Scaffold this active site. Sequence first.
Site, PDB file in Angstrom:
ATOM      1  N   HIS A 180      41.953  43.652  32.571  1.00 36.92           N
ATOM      2  CA  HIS A 180      43.254  43.923  32.724  1.00 36.92           C
ATOM      3  C   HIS A 180      43.590  44.824  31.507  1.00 36.92           C
ATOM      4  CE1 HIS A 180      44.671  40.738  35.734  1.00 36.92           C
ATOM      5  NE2 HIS A 180      43.373  40.147  35.198  1.00 36.92           N
TER       6      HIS A 180
ATOM      7  N   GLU B 160      42.608  30.952  41.231  1.00 38.99           N
ATOM      8  CA  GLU B 160      42.361  30.856  40.075  1.00 38.99           C
ATOM      9  C   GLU B 160      43.024  29.549  39.424  1.00 38.99           C
ATOM     10  OE1 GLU B 160      42.249  33.232  35.690  1.00 38.99           O
ATOM     11  OE2 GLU B 160      43.446  34.079  37.192  1.00 38.99           O
TER      12      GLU B 160
ATOM     13  N   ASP C 188      37.546  39.936  32.101  1.00 32.24           N
ATOM     14  CA  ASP C 188      38.735  39.931  32.391  1.00 32.24           C
ATOM     15  C   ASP C 188      39.758  40.338  31.185  1.00 32.24           C
ATOM     16  OD1 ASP C 188      40.487  36.633  33.387  1.00 32.24           O
ATOM     17  OD2 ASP C 188      40.742  38.611  34.074  1.00 32.24           O
TER      18      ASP C 188
END
Lengths: 411, 411
Positions: B58, B212, B308
């Site tokens: 991200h 998630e 991530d």
Amino acid sequence: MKIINARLRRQEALFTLDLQDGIIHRITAQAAMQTADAGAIDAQGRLAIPPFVEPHIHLDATLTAGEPEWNRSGTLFEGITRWSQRKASITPEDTRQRALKTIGMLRDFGVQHVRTHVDVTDPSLAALQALLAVKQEAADLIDLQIVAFPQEGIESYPNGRELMTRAIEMGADVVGGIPHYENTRDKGVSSVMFLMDLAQRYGRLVDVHCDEIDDPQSRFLEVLAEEARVRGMGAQVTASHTCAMGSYDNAYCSKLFRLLKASGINFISCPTESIHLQGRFDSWPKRRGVTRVAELDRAGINVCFAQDSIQDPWYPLGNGNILRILDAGLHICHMLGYDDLQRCLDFVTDNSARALCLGDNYGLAEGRPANLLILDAENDYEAVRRQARVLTSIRHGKVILQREVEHIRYP
Amino acid sequence: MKIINARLRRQEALFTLDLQDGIIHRITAQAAMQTADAGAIDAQGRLAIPPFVEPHIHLDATLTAGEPEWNRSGTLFEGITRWSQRKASITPEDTRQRALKTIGMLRDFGVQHVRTHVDVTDPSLAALQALLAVKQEAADLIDLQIVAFPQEGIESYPNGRELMTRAIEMGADVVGGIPHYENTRDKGVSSVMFLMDLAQRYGRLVDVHCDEIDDPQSRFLEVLAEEARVRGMGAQVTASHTCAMGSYDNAYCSKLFRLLKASGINFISCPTESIHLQGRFDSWPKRRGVTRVAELDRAGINVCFAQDSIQDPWYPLGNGNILRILDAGLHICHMLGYDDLQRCLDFVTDNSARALCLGDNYGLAEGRPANLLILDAENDYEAVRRQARVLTSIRHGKVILQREVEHIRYP
Ligand SMILES: Cc1c[nH]c(=O)nc1N
Ligand SMILES: Cc1c[nH]c(=O)nc1N
Ligand SMILES: [Fe+2]
Ligand SMILES: [Fe+2]
């Protein structure tokens, strides 16, 4: 020898450290960053810390992965089976060479204090003999403690009690154990009574493989902590691999913590090893299988992290770097909070030194031995985030390792 | 340029690689180690590999940890709250600076392919604007893919469908989603129908934050996989963060694998992130909360690992090094078998390239782009065990990074 522009842990000021005659002669705060001074070591704002500690490793088994075959299931129990096969070809010279290589790796990563377990359920006591000599041979690099570890049980292996006693008389510094592996619960309990009596009779430390299993009813920890409390020897007692605590009934565990605190014993967790060996008998969801490290620490109980294995029948990886273990531990134990990260180096330095009872032979204080590292980071958080390289290792006032600062070239 | 004495993955021979005009001209096996040549790069027996891939990061949120306050609970949900606060001070220039810094970190660790999710539940679409520009600005270092990621939901956020559509029209290459976060199960399902229709209408790839969460009833994965299967778009679809699969009923999960295989979709796991964010609503024993990576791979399903986050509202650490993530994944997912270790680089190179549909623009084969690394290790096992440094990164036939081999001195 002088070191300038050094950070110390959890402080904002820069310090000069004066080393003389193998001890820390003087530590002085500086007003600010100073230009170089008569060939002093310029830390350049990097952290100076006492050496890393490896409070739990099996040097007798190190570098034997796949000999004569592999641990296919990745379990504690197959590991023991494979180690038993390997023991048939252990020699003192074989043990010495592997141990020295792995000690070299630890030195490369700033470790100057090591506690090794050695399997004494071996009638030859060959590895123990080799490691007692290695303790002298490698003193220029590390201070080695040796644990008489009865891998196949005290009560459950032929002459187990004689072997433990002989190992202690030969000079092992620490009394070990493995109560969860004894054949019956009652023999698990008697093993703890025996090993504590042994340690008291010979005035030795204690470090026990306590409940390295995912069974919520493996509760030998309570027996060990109570003996330590009653005998007044808590500071001299460590419980290693209390993996079962990560599966305990919560009401029991809350009650148990009162004893754990009162007993004063230490805890060692081996997160990379346990994440690999534990959870193997679950399907899904799969438990982490690590002890309650954050909760112990919050309770004021001393806990620390260790590597356990380097390329052995239980664990195929390992490189000597305790910062990798710290990283793993912080993730698995849910200790990535802001406050956790600001003091996380505790778990691989100070707390580990306490478990090993190093006392005044450890720590950056005037009058103490000149054993210290310069890390390529300015605080605890950056050290773990960057996996900071050890740039300098100083032992007894002399540089024993010097790494260049990494330099990357770009077009 | 010429590289000699290079190992290739899972092969015993040494190889010479000839690079010309930005592409791999020739790959030739050598009889043995050869003495140096006319300014050829001597790999010295080190491994040559295609670049590392970061298939899930991200970039819009990177380097914002603690702004304006910290994620104290270490949960996905508090992370979303903190990010929502930070979004109020996002600017394109702020986004650009942070994204470029983190891209620099990825480059330092040999990553040349990156897929970034960008939050498009932001009426300004400021970060997306910045990242579309960065895609061009950083083309000398990386090939960036951008996912339109609706952090606060498609159906559950004001004008969510319009925002997704606008983001795609602006040029996001990949359609994202977050069905498990939609306010009701039925809206989670409609969100998947919508995003698949969007991807088909505009001919885009798909990469969804799928389940998630540790809830065994979070089963949006089946909806996504079925849509992909029915539409024949399996290869173009990725499911990220299927954490719930690590908690599924086993009979259901066995049945589910039949569809997952038939659908052809890819999976991305983020082991360091999930060990941190998952298991937070258990007491003890505490679940790992990671998807069934080893089982997916054994079933012939493409799966890979990703970082991530780097220093963001969800995760306070991160340094760009995908090998650290590989290490974590192999431990948490019980993939430290001998066979596993001999091919573990699959999970951060080949498999990730497949997820990103890189095709013939990736891999060491004659005719393909001269994008590759020299790693300071001779095989997969050593690369992960030693956390091998990237000594050289070559992009489009040019050296873009050069590290000197670490040299330790022992005075
Ligand atoms: C490494 C190792 C050896 N033996 C044992 O009982 N437990 C371990 N973690
Ligand atoms: C990093 C991150 C952001 N947002 C989200 O929904 N999940 C994540 N793992
Ligand atoms: Fe151990
Ligand atoms: Fe994500």
